[PDB]
Amino acid sequence: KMVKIYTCIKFMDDQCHWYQEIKGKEVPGTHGKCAADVAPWIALRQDRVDSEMYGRSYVEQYYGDLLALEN
């Protein structure tokens, strides 16, 4: 049997913040703080497509040709 464990991230005043919680109450000693320029978390995306919360994979470009060749 497993138990779910979550993590939260908040970005403000160029100072990222995080903490760990399980079953609705925070785990003691898991707090942290550092400047945004030295953040430990990095988000990436393949093709920078503006106004999108998630990017597009490169292979999506040739998905159609892949399917046609397969068939």
Added chain:
Amino acid sequence: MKTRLTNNVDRQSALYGSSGGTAAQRYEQLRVDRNSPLKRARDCSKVTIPGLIEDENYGDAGRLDTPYQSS
């Protein structure tokens, strides 16, 4: 035991509590918008590499298919 998934380089004392909802509620709220890109990535993976990104019920006892092209 000692839940140490985060480094103790920037650890600090408790600075935020539960002022408004829980991380589980926010996760459940954002998964609705996260849905579609996961489906796109899963389909692309299935057409290129059968078992890279997996469905939630194709783990310990899931079977993967094979394509008819290796490009």
Added chain:
Amino acid sequence: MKTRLTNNVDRQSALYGSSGGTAAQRYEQLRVDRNSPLKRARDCSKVTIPGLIEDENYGDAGRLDTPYQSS
């Protein structure tokens, strides 16, 4: 927080007021002229690279199409 999208090298005091309308009105007036070249650029992007220039409602949860040539 601190809205700094402009550099702090030539910042000065308030020299220009609201002498005639707001920039939003000018933008709305000029968008009519700006319309057509946007359409031309959008169609050229669509025929050359499907997701480079996008419509205002094909972002977070939009799907693009793939051409039948890669020249």
